[PDB]
PDB file of C-alpha atoms and ligand atoms in Angstrom:
ATOM      1  CA  UNK A  23      78.957 -13.793  21.076  1.00 53.06           C
ATOM      2  CA  UNK A  24      83.102 -13.406  21.986  1.00 53.89           C
ATOM      3  CA  UNK A  25      85.162 -16.126  19.922  1.00 53.12           C
ATOM      4  CA  UNK A  26      86.300 -18.549  23.176  1.00 50.93           C
ATOM      5  CA  UNK A  27      84.883 -19.497  25.784  1.00 48.80           C
ATOM      6  CA  UNK A  28      85.895 -21.511  28.192  1.00 47.42           C
ATOM      7  CA  UNK A  29      84.372 -21.662  32.459  1.00 50.83           C
ATOM      8  CA  UNK A  30      86.859 -24.157  33.417  1.00 50.69           C
ATOM      9  CA  UNK A  31      89.063 -21.360  33.025  1.00 49.38           C
ATOM     10  CA  UNK A  32      86.743 -18.617  35.328  1.00 46.51           C
ATOM     11  CA  UNK A  33      87.107 -21.461  38.413  1.00 47.11           C
ATOM     12  CA  UNK A  34      83.325 -22.013  37.541  1.00 46.43           C
ATOM     13  CA  UNK A  35      83.407 -26.425  37.298  1.00 45.17           C
ATOM     14  CA  UNK A  36      84.171 -28.833  39.567  1.00 48.50           C
ATOM     15  CA  UNK A  37      86.872 -31.562  38.493  1.00 47.62           C
ATOM     16  CA  UNK A  38      85.212 -35.183  36.832  1.00 47.10           C
ATOM     17  CA  UNK A  39      82.944 -36.581  38.562  1.00 45.12           C
ATOM     18  CA  UNK A  40      82.216 -41.166  37.907  1.00 46.26           C
ATOM     19  CA  UNK A  41      78.420 -41.942  37.525  1.00 49.24           C
ATOM     20  CA  UNK A  42      79.916 -45.470  37.893  1.00 47.90           C
ATOM     21  CA  UNK A  43      77.610 -48.513  37.242  1.00 48.63           C
ATOM     22  CA  UNK A  44      74.342 -45.922  37.228  1.00 48.10           C
ATOM     23  CA  UNK A  45      72.623 -44.522  34.414  1.00 46.60           C
ATOM     24  CA  UNK A  46      72.677 -40.989  36.328  1.00 45.23           C
ATOM     25  CA  UNK A  47      74.089 -38.999  33.756  1.00 43.03           C
ATOM     26  CA  UNK A  48      71.113 -36.937  33.866  1.00 39.67           C
ATOM     27  CA  UNK A  49      71.762 -36.230  38.195  1.00 40.11           C
ATOM     28  CA  UNK A  50      75.284 -35.298  37.148  1.00 39.49           C
ATOM     29  CA  UNK A  51      73.861 -33.103  33.890  1.00 39.54           C
ATOM     30  CA  UNK A  52      71.900 -31.292  36.318  1.00 38.91           C
ATOM     31  CA  UNK A  53      73.527 -30.751  39.322  1.00 40.04           C
ATOM     32  CA  UNK A  54      76.948 -29.192  37.119  1.00 42.84           C
ATOM     33  CA  UNK A  55      75.122 -26.675  35.636  1.00 40.71           C
ATOM     34  CA  UNK A  56      73.882 -25.560  39.587  1.00 41.45           C
ATOM     35  CA  UNK A  57      77.365 -26.110  40.860  1.00 37.35           C
ATOM     36  CA  UNK A  58      78.891 -23.811  37.558  1.00 37.52           C
ATOM     37  CA  UNK A  59      75.847 -21.242  38.085  1.00 42.55           C
ATOM     38  CA  UNK A  60      76.077 -20.359  42.248  1.00 43.90           C
ATOM     39  CA  UNK A  61      79.217 -20.144  41.026  1.00 43.59           C
ATOM     40  CA  UNK A  62      78.925 -17.379  38.162  1.00 44.24           C
ATOM     41  CA  UNK A  63      76.595 -15.424  40.337  1.00 47.29           C
ATOM     42  CA  UNK A  64      78.898 -15.068  43.339  1.00 45.20           C
ATOM     43  CA  UNK A  65      78.860 -17.688  45.364  1.00 46.96           C
ATOM     44  CA  UNK A  66      82.221 -20.139  45.989  1.00 46.66           C
ATOM     45  CA  UNK A  67      82.596 -22.441  44.664  1.00 46.04           C
ATOM     46  CA  UNK A  68      80.753 -25.807  45.976  1.00 45.57           C
ATOM     47  CA  UNK A  69      80.649 -29.939  45.182  1.00 41.87           C
ATOM     48  CA  UNK A  70      76.582 -30.524  45.115  1.00 40.96           C
ATOM     49  CA  UNK A  71      74.825 -33.627  45.797  1.00 41.62           C
ATOM     50  CA  UNK A  72      74.198 -35.795  42.963  1.00 37.81           C
ATOM     51  CA  UNK A  73      72.600 -38.773  44.826  1.00 38.65           C
ATOM     52  CA  UNK A  74      70.309 -36.251  46.306  1.00 40.76           C
ATOM     53  CA  UNK A  75      68.461 -36.862  43.072  1.00 41.42           C
ATOM     54  CA  UNK A  76      69.457 -40.079  42.287  1.00 42.63           C
ATOM     55  CA  UNK A  77      67.849 -41.598  45.582  1.00 40.19           C
ATOM     56  CA  UNK A  78      64.894 -38.526  46.577  1.00 37.37           C
ATOM     57  CA  UNK A  79      63.278 -37.406  43.183  1.00 37.87           C
ATOM     58  CA  UNK A  80      60.459 -38.532  42.773  1.00 40.22           C
ATOM     59  CA  UNK A  81      59.783 -37.400  39.109  1.00 42.17           C
ATOM     60  CA  UNK A  82      62.495 -39.506  37.962  1.00 43.64           C
ATOM     61  CA  UNK A  83      64.167 -43.431  38.519  1.00 43.56           C
ATOM     62  CA  UNK A  84      67.603 -42.676  39.434  1.00 46.50           C
ATOM     63  CA  UNK A  85      69.866 -45.690  38.373  1.00 47.19           C
ATOM     64  CA  UNK A  86      67.633 -46.140  35.963  1.00 46.84           C
ATOM     65  CA  UNK A  87      67.324 -42.929  33.426  1.00 43.57           C
ATOM     66  CA  UNK A  88      65.777 -38.957  34.409  1.00 49.37           C
ATOM     67  CA  UNK A  89      65.450 -35.594  32.642  1.00 51.84           C
ATOM     68  CA  UNK A  90      67.439 -32.902  33.696  1.00 52.88           C
ATOM     69  CA  UNK A  91      63.766 -30.890  32.960  1.00 56.06           C
ATOM     70  CA  UNK A  92      62.026 -33.216  35.552  1.00 54.22           C
ATOM     71  CA  UNK A  93      65.547 -33.061  38.426  1.00 55.79           C
ATOM     72  CA  UNK A  94      65.007 -28.710  38.149  1.00 56.08           C
ATOM     73  CA  UNK A  95      61.010 -29.113  38.256  1.00 59.08           C
ATOM     74  CA  UNK A  96      61.886 -31.418  41.917  1.00 60.89           C
ATOM     75  CA  UNK A  97      64.507 -29.482  43.136  1.00 57.99           C
ATOM     76  CA  UNK A  98      61.808 -26.365  42.642  1.00 59.80           C
ATOM     77  CA  UNK A  99      58.434 -28.211  43.548  1.00 62.51           C
ATOM     78  CA  UNK A 100      59.131 -30.306  45.958  1.00 63.28           C
ATOM     79  CA  UNK A 101      63.044 -29.201  48.045  1.00 64.79           C
ATOM     80  CA  UNK A 102      62.088 -25.761  47.904  1.00 65.00           C
ATOM     81  CA  UNK A 103      64.970 -25.000  45.906  1.00 62.35           C
ATOM     82  CA  UNK A 104      67.517 -26.471  47.416  1.00 65.48           C
ATOM     83  CA  UNK A 105      70.603 -28.765  46.979  1.00 65.83           C
ATOM     84  CA  UNK A 106      72.698 -30.288  49.659  1.00 61.95           C
ATOM     85  CA  UNK A 107      77.087 -30.203  49.506  1.00 60.02           C
ATOM     86  CA  UNK A 108      78.518 -34.087  48.361  1.00 63.35           C
ATOM     87  CA  UNK A 109      79.756 -33.902  51.906  1.00 61.04           C
ATOM     88  CA  UNK A 110      76.547 -33.877  53.463  1.00 57.46           C
ATOM     89  CA  UNK A 111      75.098 -36.242  51.172  1.00 57.59           C
ATOM     90  CA  UNK A 112      77.654 -38.203  49.562  1.00 55.23           C
ATOM     91  CA  UNK A 113      77.390 -40.200  45.925  1.00 54.84           C
ATOM     92  CA  UNK A 114      76.908 -43.948  47.014  1.00 56.64           C
ATOM     93  CA  UNK A 115      75.694 -45.325  43.486  1.00 58.48           C
ATOM     94  CA  UNK A 116      78.583 -45.926  41.379  1.00 58.38           C
ATOM     95  CA  UNK A 117      77.811 -49.639  42.329  1.00 57.61           C
ATOM     96  CA  UNK A 118      73.937 -49.697  40.820  1.00 60.01           C
ATOM     97  CA  UNK A 119      72.663 -49.759  44.748  1.00 60.85           C
ATOM     98  CA  UNK A 120      69.830 -47.219  44.704  1.00 57.05           C
ATOM     99  CA  UNK A 121      68.859 -46.420  48.420  1.00 58.55           C
ATOM    100  CA  UNK A 122      65.975 -45.064  49.815  1.00 62.55           C
ATOM    101  CA  UNK A 123      66.300 -40.992  50.053  1.00 58.80           C
ATOM    102  CA  UNK A 124      67.556 -40.102  53.647  1.00 57.56           C
ATOM    103  CA  UNK A 125      66.490 -36.437  53.685  1.00 57.14           C
ATOM    104  CA  UNK A 126      67.258 -34.413  57.371  1.00 57.71           C
ATOM    105  CA  UNK A 127      69.591 -32.196  58.764  1.00 57.09           C
ATOM    106  CA  UNK A 128      71.199 -32.067  55.563  1.00 58.77           C
ATOM    107  CA  UNK A 129      73.939 -28.349  54.490  1.00 59.26           C
ATOM    108  CA  UNK A 130      72.936 -26.520  52.197  1.00 61.68           C
ATOM    109  CA  UNK A 131      75.244 -25.664  49.630  1.00 61.92           C
ATOM    110  CA  UNK A 132      73.218 -23.777  46.879  1.00 63.37           C
ATOM    111  CA  UNK A 133      69.268 -22.178  45.697  1.00 64.34           C
ATOM    112  CA  UNK A 134      68.185 -22.629  42.617  1.00 63.79           C
ATOM    113  CA  UNK A 135      64.425 -20.334  42.356  1.00 63.66           C
ATOM    114  CA  UNK A 136      63.713 -21.622  38.625  1.00 63.45           C
ATOM    115  CA  UNK A 137      65.210 -23.258  35.271  1.00 64.47           C
ATOM    116  CA  UNK A 138      64.944 -22.154  31.551  1.00 67.21           C
ATOM    117  CA  UNK A 139      64.293 -23.967  28.325  1.00 64.15           C
ATOM    118  CA  UNK A 140      67.381 -22.423  25.673  1.00 67.52           C
ATOM    119  CA  UNK A 141      66.638 -21.936  22.039  1.00 69.94           C
ATOM    120  CA  UNK A 142      67.770 -24.632  19.719  1.00 65.86           C
ATOM    121  CA  UNK A 143      70.231 -22.429  17.803  1.00 63.88           C
ATOM    122  CA  UNK A 144      74.244 -22.866  18.820  1.00 64.84           C
ATOM    123  CA  UNK A 145      74.803 -19.342  17.889  1.00 65.89           C
ATOM    124  CA  UNK A 146      71.711 -18.479  20.527  1.00 66.07           C
ATOM    125  CA  UNK A 147      73.363 -21.718  23.003  1.00 68.39           C
ATOM    126  CA  UNK A 148      76.919 -19.767  22.974  1.00 66.91           C
ATOM    127  CA  UNK A 149      75.847 -16.412  23.919  1.00 68.47           C
ATOM    128  CA  UNK A 150      73.601 -17.455  26.433  1.00 71.33           C
ATOM    129  CA  UNK A 151      76.781 -19.406  27.578  1.00 69.83           C
ATOM    130  CA  UNK A 152      79.301 -17.239  27.510  1.00 68.38           C
ATOM    131  CA  UNK A 153      77.228 -14.929  29.557  1.00 68.90           C
ATOM    132  CA  UNK A 154      75.701 -17.226  32.168  1.00 69.90           C
ATOM    133  CA  UNK A 155      78.147 -20.081  32.179  1.00 64.89           C
ATOM    134  CA  UNK A 156      77.665 -23.868  31.683  1.00 61.40           C
ATOM    135  CA  UNK A 157      74.505 -25.467  29.888  1.00 61.45           C
ATOM    136  CA  UNK A 158      73.264 -29.041  31.045  1.00 61.36           C
ATOM    137  CA  UNK A 159      72.392 -30.139  27.531  1.00 66.35           C
ATOM    138  CA  UNK A 160      71.107 -33.916  25.837  1.00 64.69           C
ATOM    139  CA  UNK A 161      73.470 -34.861  22.944  1.00 67.47           C
ATOM    140  CA  UNK A 162      73.249 -38.956  21.502  1.00 67.34           C
ATOM    141  CA  UNK A 163      76.256 -40.719  22.856  1.00 66.17           C
ATOM    142  CA  UNK A 164      76.494 -43.167  20.492  1.00 66.33           C
ATOM    143  CA  UNK A 165      79.580 -41.822  19.644  1.00 67.15           C
ATOM    144  CA  UNK A 166      80.775 -41.329  22.599  1.00 66.53           C
ATOM    145  CA  UNK A 167      81.616 -45.221  23.331  1.00 68.39           C
ATOM    146  CA  UNK A 168      85.100 -44.877  21.646  1.00 69.50           C
ATOM    147  CA  UNK A 169      86.061 -41.468  21.147  1.00 70.88           C
ATOM    148  CA  UNK A 170      89.458 -41.332  22.729  1.00 72.62           C
ATOM    149  CA  UNK A 171      90.187 -37.600  22.100  1.00 73.83           C
ATOM    150  CA  UNK A 172      90.109 -34.978  19.397  1.00 73.58           C
ATOM    151  CA  UNK A 173      86.896 -32.825  17.945  1.00 76.50           C
ATOM    152  CA  UNK A 174      84.123 -35.477  16.946  1.00 79.15           C
ATOM    153  CA  UNK A 175      83.080 -34.676  13.535  1.00 77.80           C
ATOM    154  CA  UNK A 176      80.569 -37.365  12.341  1.00 78.64           C
ATOM    155  CA  UNK A 177      78.721 -37.879  15.373  1.00 77.87           C
ATOM    156  CA  UNK A 178      75.896 -40.071  15.170  1.00 77.30           C
ATOM    157  CA  UNK A 179      72.440 -37.673  15.986  1.00 76.96           C
ATOM    158  CA  UNK A 180      69.697 -39.988  16.111  1.00 77.88           C
ATOM    159  CA  UNK A 181      68.341 -40.250  19.321  1.00 78.48           C
ATOM    160  CA  UNK A 182      69.086 -38.237  22.648  1.00 78.65           C
ATOM    161  CA  UNK A 183      69.980 -40.823  25.384  1.00 76.87           C
ATOM    162  CA  UNK A 184      72.904 -38.985  27.770  1.00 79.49           C
ATOM    163  CA  UNK A 185      72.800 -36.127  29.406  1.00 78.14           C
ATOM    164  CA  UNK A 186      75.889 -33.705  29.936  1.00 76.82           C
ATOM    165  CA  UNK A 187      77.758 -30.250  30.507  1.00 77.66           C
ATOM    166  CA  UNK A 188      78.296 -27.509  28.115  1.00 77.92           C
ATOM    167  CA  UNK A 189      81.661 -25.580  29.342  1.00 75.85           C
ATOM    168  CA  UNK A 190      82.956 -23.704  26.455  1.00 76.11           C
ATOM    169  CA  UNK A 191      83.626 -23.337  23.181  1.00 74.95           C
ATOM    170  CA  UNK A 192      86.354 -22.146  20.374  1.00 74.63           C
ATOM    171  CA  UNK A 193      85.353 -20.174  17.097  1.00 75.13           C
ATOM    172  CA  UNK A 194      89.452 -20.454  16.612  1.00 71.89           C
ATOM    173  CA  UNK A 195      89.461 -23.537  15.668  1.00 69.38           C
ATOM    174  CA  UNK A 196      89.528 -25.108  12.699  1.00 69.15           C
ATOM    175  CA  UNK A 197      87.414 -26.536  13.194  1.00 69.28           C
ATOM    176  CA  UNK A 198      85.205 -25.049  15.186  1.00 64.03           C
ATOM    177  CA  UNK A 199      83.790 -27.085  18.785  1.00 64.14           C
ATOM    178  CA  UNK A 200      82.641 -26.772  22.150  1.00 61.70           C
ATOM    179  CA  UNK A 201      83.630 -28.632  25.043  1.00 61.19           C
ATOM    180  CA  UNK A 202      81.650 -31.114  27.101  1.00 63.08           C
ATOM    181  CA  UNK A 203      82.237 -32.247  30.728  1.00 63.99           C
ATOM    182  CA  UNK A 204      81.155 -36.322  30.766  1.00 60.57           C
ATOM    183  CA  UNK A 205      80.894 -37.872  34.332  1.00 61.68           C
ATOM    184  CA  UNK A 206      82.008 -41.065  33.307  1.00 62.19           C
ATOM    185  CA  UNK A 207      85.868 -40.755  35.176  1.00 62.55           C
ATOM    186  CA  UNK A 208      88.341 -38.251  34.527  1.00 61.09           C
ATOM    187  CA  UNK A 209      90.481 -41.376  32.442  1.00 63.22           C
ATOM    188  CA  UNK A 210      87.613 -41.835  29.942  1.00 63.67           C
ATOM    189  CA  UNK A 211      87.932 -38.266  26.724  1.00 63.11           C
ATOM    190  CA  UNK A 212      90.372 -35.812  27.558  1.00 61.26           C
ATOM    191  CA  UNK A 213      90.716 -36.024  30.869  1.00 60.88           C
ATOM    192  CA  UNK A 214      87.304 -36.522  30.830  1.00 60.47           C
ATOM    193  CA  UNK A 215      85.953 -34.379  28.624  1.00 64.49           C
ATOM    194  CA  UNK A 216      84.778 -34.428  24.946  1.00 62.49           C
ATOM    195  CA  UNK A 217      85.003 -31.946  22.100  1.00 65.40           C
ATOM    196  CA  UNK A 218      82.299 -31.469  19.439  1.00 63.56           C
ATOM    197  CA  UNK A 219      82.572 -29.685  16.124  1.00 66.21           C
ATOM    198  CA  UNK A 220      80.811 -26.595  16.256  1.00 65.80           C
ATOM    199  CA  UNK A 221      77.684 -25.352  14.088  1.00 64.06           C
ATOM    200  CA  UNK A 222      77.056 -28.983  12.746  1.00 66.73           C
ATOM    201  CA  UNK A 223      74.520 -29.869  15.556  1.00 70.54           C
ATOM    202  CA  UNK A 224      76.720 -33.066  16.427  1.00 68.10           C
ATOM    203  CA  UNK A 225      75.407 -35.753  18.611  1.00 69.58           C
ATOM    204  CA  UNK A 226      71.743 -33.274  18.626  1.00 69.97           C
ATOM    205  CA  UNK A 227      73.153 -31.301  21.363  1.00 71.36           C
ATOM    206  CA  UNK A 228      70.944 -28.045  20.525  1.00 69.69           C
ATOM    207  CA  UNK A 229      68.139 -30.105  20.866  1.00 72.53           C
ATOM    208  CA  UNK A 230      68.039 -30.142  24.646  1.00 72.47           C
ATOM    209  CA  UNK A 231      69.581 -27.883  26.733  1.00 71.45           C
ATOM    210  CA  UNK A 232      69.190 -25.657  30.222  1.00 67.07           C
ATOM    211  CA  UNK A 233      69.904 -24.546  33.051  1.00 68.21           C
ATOM    212  CA  UNK A 234      68.852 -23.187  36.712  1.00 68.12           C
ATOM    213  CA  UNK A 235      68.398 -19.799  37.688  1.00 68.73           C
ATOM    214  CA  UNK A 236      69.989 -18.849  40.110  1.00 66.54           C
ATOM    215  CA  UNK A 237      67.835 -15.868  41.946  1.00 66.85           C
TER     216      UNK A 237
HETATM  217  C1  D1R B  14      72.638 -41.816  31.233  1.00 64.90           C
HETATM  218  C2  D1R B  14      73.231 -41.833  30.260  1.00 64.90           C
HETATM  219  S1  D1R B  14      74.830 -42.911  30.603  1.00 64.90           S
HETATM  220  O1  D1R B  14      75.860 -42.348  30.920  1.00 64.90           O
HETATM  221  O2  D1R B  14      75.288 -43.381  28.766  1.00 64.90           O
HETATM  222  C3  D1R B  14      74.369 -44.571  30.651  1.00 64.90           C
HETATM  223  C4  D1R B  14      74.459 -45.140  32.070  1.00 64.90           C
HETATM  224  C5  D1R B  14      74.256 -46.802  31.665  1.00 64.90           C
HETATM  225  C6  D1R B  14      73.316 -47.588  30.610  1.00 64.90           C
HETATM  226  C7  D1R B  14      73.610 -46.863  29.904  1.00 64.90           C
HETATM  227  C8  D1R B  14      73.878 -45.605  29.131  1.00 64.90           C
HETATM  228  C9  D1R B  14      71.117 -42.338  31.221  1.00 64.90           C
HETATM  229  C10 D1R B  14      71.733 -44.121  30.983  1.00 64.90           C
HETATM  230  C11 D1R B  14      69.976 -44.568  31.358  1.00 64.90           C
HETATM  231  C12 D1R B  14      69.935 -45.512  30.869  1.00 64.90           C
HETATM  232  C13 D1R B  14      69.628 -46.495  32.203  1.00 64.90           C
HETATM  233  C14 D1R B  14      70.117 -48.191  32.089  1.00 64.90           C
HETATM  234  C15 D1R B  14      69.814 -48.750  30.974  1.00 64.90           C
HETATM  235  C16 D1R B  14      70.754 -47.959  29.239  1.00 64.90           C
HETATM  236  C17 D1R B  14      69.952 -46.651  29.758  1.00 64.90           C
HETATM  237  N1  D1R B  14      70.432 -41.576  30.151  1.00 64.90           N
HETATM  238  C18 D1R B  14      69.303 -41.128  30.673  1.00 64.90           C
HETATM  239  O3  D1R B  14      68.604 -40.991  32.148  1.00 64.90           O
HETATM  240  C19 D1R B  14      68.288 -40.182  29.822  1.00 64.90           C
HETATM  241  C20 D1R B  14      69.203 -39.024  29.598  1.00 64.90           C
HETATM  242  C21 D1R B  14      68.318 -37.880  29.046  1.00 64.90           C
HETATM  243  C22 D1R B  14      68.232 -36.819  29.260  1.00 64.90           C
HETATM  244  C23 D1R B  14      67.788 -35.652  28.340  1.00 64.90           C
HETATM  245  C24 D1R B  14      67.253 -35.930  27.583  1.00 64.90           C
HETATM  246  C25 D1R B  14      66.939 -37.632  26.752  1.00 64.90           C
HETATM  247  C26 D1R B  14      67.786 -37.799  28.030  1.00 64.90           C
HETATM  248  N2  D1R B  14      66.880 -40.352  29.694  1.00 64.90           N
HETATM  249  C27 D1R B  14      66.234 -41.410  29.391  1.00 64.90           C
HETATM  250  O4  D1R B  14      66.679 -41.826  28.299  1.00 64.90           O
HETATM  251  N3  D1R B  14      65.024 -41.205  29.716  1.00 64.90           N
HETATM  252  C28 D1R B  14      64.087 -40.240  30.009  1.00 64.90           C
HETATM  253  C29 D1R B  14      63.253 -40.896  31.382  1.00 64.90           C
HETATM  254  N4  D1R B  14      62.574 -42.096  30.806  1.00 64.90           N
HETATM  255  C30 D1R B  14      61.529 -42.578  31.545  1.00 64.90           C
HETATM  256  C31 D1R B  14      63.480 -42.820  30.097  1.00 64.90           C
HETATM  257  C32 D1R B  14      64.438 -41.945  28.711  1.00 64.90           C
END
């Protein structure tokens, strides 16, 4: 793996979004990953629909929670691999209301064929990220609640409860760090991002890493 990668500098990351008062973190994680994989395959960056997942994925529980694994499963096996654009199916669940699935004649922004689980190994994860693009990960978000910036080095690491997007890392920092896009608006953290120390499995970040496969 290279010393540093930041997919924001390669055009593969959309602006920071806000889930609002809905526990839809798992949907943001999933969609952020597909946004990045679709761009890295050689297509234009396009904002895709979390609402499609919140309202239509029947394996997961909308604002009550979900898993990236299940969302990828639903997309491929229940929705023919298709992901609608945000413009066609915009996010309305920020107030916690969950409307019924609409699905009819939406604009398709991206298509995926499969998804993969990555090894529970920070170096393997770094290598795959460097070659392939931003990855869906789960963390213990206990220490995120009080974060304002800097590199978090004493992250509570006990129970996975949040899905975020891994967008880069820097091994030429003391300490080395991962760069993570959160879904709590650009007013949280470092313009919506958090840096956590790399190499000490901070927040249990290595435990549940996955990605869609395009093509
Ligand atoms: C998002 C995390 S959040 O942004 O921190 C958040 C939002 C709102 C309230 C608290 C925290 C959601 C939160 C789910 C939630 C809803 C209502 C009250 C409390 C919590 N977290 C999840 O959906 C997690 C994500 C996840 C992904 C991968 C691995 C582990 C966790 N999913 C989750 O906790 N599940 C999965 C589905 N399930 C049946 C119960 C457990």
